[PDB]
RNA sequence: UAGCUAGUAGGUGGGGUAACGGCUCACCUAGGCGACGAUCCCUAGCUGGUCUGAGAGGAUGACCAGCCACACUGGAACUGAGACACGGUCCAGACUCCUACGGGAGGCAGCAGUGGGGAAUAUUGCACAAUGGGCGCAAGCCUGAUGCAGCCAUGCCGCGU
RNA sequence: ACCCGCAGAAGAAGCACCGGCUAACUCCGUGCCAGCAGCCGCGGUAAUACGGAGGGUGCAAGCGUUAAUCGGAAUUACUGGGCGUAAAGCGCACGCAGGCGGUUUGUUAAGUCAGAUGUGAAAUCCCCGGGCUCAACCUGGGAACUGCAUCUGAUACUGGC
């Protein structure tokens, strides 16, 4: 999966997915690609739809200010 | 046994020959002797000699086939749940292609070889190679 | 071929309608041992001349009644 | 079918006689044999006995050039038999007209052999051919039938016929436009790859 | 095991090749994709595989794979379900085949045509 | 109502008709009473021939059963009966 | 025969001082007769080294095979553990689908008139070993009333 | 599905079919019935034989022969022995049509063909030439029975290629 | 049906596999992707396998797929499978059913042991001939008659007695 790169902030961790609220504000339950891993809710992401399901293939988790084990 | 005498017979043999009890003795029932006879006359035992049928003794002498145990095969198959002897030699054979497995005919218990082979049926009463 | 069979009636107070056992074996065969396959026909009884352990021969017949289609014929013996 | 196929190259992969690039240069030469005909796909033989045996029988199938459809047919007939299934099959196989179109020396290649029969252009004393799928008789004067009569193929063939798969059994002739299949092919004269407990063994569930 | 016991309740020869239930029949079905969905495979095969739920008319709304590289249109594309599940996919039951008619054709494949690649014209 | 008719048998063109008793009732074949010969009209070695077994036929007929003209074939076949 | 087939060398693992090592140990069959097939269990560290140690071993004890028609005297059955095995006297002239566990040992015996089949297990370790145990047993006869007159 | 019976059975008698027989009523008797598995439910039409499997067995039931069951909704008799007849009997009806609209009227589990269903599988076919069966006094006629041929790798064997 | 002419094969290979196993594998895109991928798994792997290219295998007018069966599976064991612990002693009894009990002759002859004969239809199956263009396609002949069905001898066996 691929789609169209778009920005979003990860509104929610959808368990299995992550649900991304887009730059627009549009929430898309998205997949999260095997390729990306630095994702968290709050990340600004490049998520893409499919060609909802999205896919996430870029993230943006900014610097540490809190963790658990350390993440 | 407690409920199949031929199968004790057979087993006693089994355990007998096993422990190369080249003689195994147990009561006759008329079949028992009769069978024993055939074995007797079929090298398996060379003889039996008997005393009693409502009282005990029927002593079979198992040879050595050839230094090795006479029988080197023997076991029950005629439990009160089982017979497969149909008339007109609608009883054929299993491992009695090597030994006997004395049948009981019109009258009697015989070497099976005789009634069996002979189409005379014979009831295939017990089992040896 | 024969169906006058020396069965046996045994049924009684079975008012005029007793049954004759034209009995049989059936082997449970593939997976062994001998069971009965069994036939009773309310035979000629007809006021119960098919009786108690009256090992009754019956001769196959017309329905003379609801089951009297094995007429009896004999009684041969009594059995326990 | 012939089954359709290209001849010298072939001779390189199966590596044995099967009677098929008949002309004036055949196998290898001017382009050897056994130095490929591939250059990618044969690059790691993933054999098994299935392989070995496959090839083993495959040869034999090819030796007669028969379609498998038919080959099968032979196998079975033999198999019914009280005998050791194998042998009796070979007689049968061999027994057909195509087999017998090359062994008299009309045909040479199955394709050619057949080509003749096939095109109503080799005969037998055997259930109207037009087909070498036909199967020749003891006394079958497998005889030439038109547009091949001691023509190129046949004339030359009658030579190598003699030396074909020694038909002691079918009297290899084709010069007299005849070829009197005297009797059936037997393992008096072999031309086999398998063994009768390699192929017999091979067939198995 | 006394015969007498056995006889009472007998013991079953047939086969015994079982794993889990599978369904329907009719050599094909008349069906079109519910929707054409997309799922993961397994992790080290680290891919994504393209699929479709599919209403039929010879039983069961199946989810179906749409294979090789690529898949059919969304929704109910005209899709051909020519059966399937995967070794590497538990419990799918009829699949939506391309390189085979109704569907789209298995794209970016031409390394098979009775199956995959093209649904070249059944001569 | 007994009939002895020729059931057209053998794969067509070559019928390998086979004279048979059946209830004349079936338009063509259907119910079978018992077989009674053949008439194969094409190219065969034996165990495969053409049979007319005139004798049995006659028993049936006696008590009323009927016969074909391709049984008349069979009948008058060498003028076997004719 | 005089044939030997090397049934198999076998990669086993010890699981040593350091790593997890793997060997060749060989069961091979040898036979130099219908009446003689011997199979040996070799040890060693190579396919040959193993085979050899098998062959050697195998050659150690070269023993009975399909007496009577190149076929058994009598059909024989084999267990070794839980192994269900079977072999018949027949002919090879009646055919013989010459299995592995029934034209390996049979082949190094030379004979093939004996048709067989094993139920249950895929383990040659026990099963062809059981096949062997299943083949052996076909006795010494002693008349046209052998057992019937010792 | 572990429960049965009053038409119940039997007896008994009428009654009935051709007729057997509760078989049935009349009466009575109490009979009269199932855990060797009944009762109950479904499902399956069912066989020669199909399928497969070494077979065991298992499977199978074809794409036949043999037999049936069954052939517009429910009901309902016939001729005829037989048929309450896939295109022989009455209504409702269902059902749909007829219909001056009431009344009525109207129907390929024969076929193609039609609808169309479903994965999808058959010509509005040819043919009596023979084949059969019928009718027809019969002659003949009839015969989508039938022959031949139509339509589909679906299923077989080949040459070819 | 059959029969045969012509030229040239004209008009006749695709299809499936090929990462093993399994008949067949590379080269490249991809490539931890997109994917393949029966089964194991192949997917960074510069592919083998993906994806393609190419090459190889394996087939014939076919060659693959689906739906889809008994088989192997001894995997439910009849043949032929399983309770010390791998899915196998009731908590434990009793215990009716069930089943099963010694022993001896005698005896039924029923079962059995001996027989009879009929009866399996047909297909003509198989077997084994046979028939046609091989073959497919047609038939026959021994073989489906078993068991039913029934008789009976022997009677030890077995049960009857």
From Swiss-Prot, chain B:
InterPro entries xref list: Ribosomal_uS8, Ribosomal_uS8_CS, Ribosomal_uS8_sf
Pfam families xref list: Ribosomal_S8
A GO MF term: rRNA binding
Gene3D superfamilies reported in the protein's UniProt record: 3.30.1370.30, 3.30.1490.10
Record has Iron-sulfur as a keyword: no
Biological process according to GO: translation
GO CC terms of this entry: ribonucleoprotein complex; ribosome
UniProt entry keywords in alphabetical sequence: Ribonucleoprotein, Ribosomal protein, RNA-binding, rRNA-binding
Family as reported in the entry's similarity comment: Belongs to the universal ribosomal protein uS8 family.
UniProt subunit comment: Part of the 30S ribosomal subunit. Contacts proteins S5 and S12.
NCBIfam families tied to this protein: PRK00136.1
PANTHER family: 40S RIBOSOMAL PROTEIN S15A (PTHR11758)
Protein role: One of the primary rRNA binding proteins, it binds directly to 16S rRNA central domain where it helps coordinate assembly of the platform of the 30S subunit.
Annotated protein name in UniProt: Small ribosomal subunit protein uS8
Organism listed in the record: Escherichia coli (strain SE11)
Gene coding for it: rpsH
From Swiss-Prot, chain C:
Family according to the record: Belongs to the universal ribosomal protein uS17 family.
Pfam families with a match to the protein in the record: Ribosomal_S17 (PF00366)
InterPro entries to which the protein is assigned, alphabetical: NA-bd_OB-fold, Ribosomal_uS17, Ribosomal_uS17_bact/chlr, Ribosomal_uS17_CS
Disulfide bonds: none
CDD domains, A to Z: Ribosomal_uS17 (cd00364)
Keywords: Ribonucleoprotein, Ribosomal protein, RNA-binding, rRNA-binding
Stated role: One of the primary rRNA binding proteins, it binds specifically to the 5'-end of 16S ribosomal RNA.
GO cellular component, one term: cytosolic small ribosomal subunit
Protein name as catalogued: Small ribosomal subunit protein uS17
Organism of origin: Escherichia coli O157:H7
GO biological process, one term: translation
Oligomer status and interactors: Part of the 30S ribosomal subunit.
Superkingdom of the source species: Bacteria
Any GO MF annotation of the entry: rRNA binding
From Swiss-Prot, chain D:
Gene3D superfamilies per UniProt: Ribosomal Protein S4 Delta 41, Chain A, domain 1, RNA-binding S4 domain
Coiled-coil stretches noted in the UniProt entry, renumbered to this chain: none
GO BP terms, alphabetized: ribosomal small subunit biogenesis; translation
GO cellular component, one term: small ribosomal subunit
Sorted UniProt keywords: Ribonucleoprotein, Ribosomal protein, RNA-binding, rRNA-binding
InterPro entries: Ribosomal_uS4, Ribosomal_uS4_bac-type, Ribosomal_uS4_CS, Ribosomal_uS4_N, S4_RNA-bd, S4_RNA-bd_sf
Domain (S4 RNA-binding): residue spans on this chain: 95-155
MF terms (GO), sorted A to Z: rRNA binding; structural constituent of ribosome
SMART domains: Ribosomal_S4, S4
Functional summary from the UniProt entry: One of the primary rRNA binding proteins, it binds directly to 16S rRNA where it nucleates assembly of the body of the 30S subunit.
Similarity section: Belongs to the universal ribosomal protein uS4 family.
HAMAP family (UniProt xref): Ribosomal_uS4_B
Quaternary structure note: Part of the 30S ribosomal subunit. Contacts protein S5. The interaction surface between S4 and S5 is involved in control of translational fidelity.
Name listed for the protein in its UniProt record: Small ribosomal subunit protein uS4
Lineage: Bacteria, Pseudomonadati, Pseudomonadota, Gammaproteobacteria, Enterobacterales
Gene (name only): rpsD
UniProtKB/Swiss-Prot annotation, chain F:
Family: Belongs to the bacterial ribosomal protein bS16 family.
Keyword presence, Magnesium: no
PANTHER family, alphabetized: 30S RIBOSOMAL PROTEIN S16, SMALL RIBOSOMAL SUBUNIT PROTEIN BS16M
Origin organism lineage: Bacteria, Pseudomonadati, Pseudomonadota, Gammaproteobacteria, Enterobacterales
Protein name: Small ribosomal subunit protein bS16
Keywords, comma-separated and alphabetical: Ribonucleoprotein, Ribosomal protein
Domain of life: Bacteria
Encoding gene, per UniProt annotation: rpsP
Listed GO MF terms: structural constituent of ribosome
One GO CC term on file: small ribosomal subunit
InterPro entries found in the cross-reference section: Ribosomal_bS16, Ribosomal_bS16_CS, Ribosomal_bS16_dom_sf
GO BP term, pick one: translation
Alphabetized NCBIfam families for the sequence: S16
Record's keyword annotation contains Ribonucleoprotein: yes
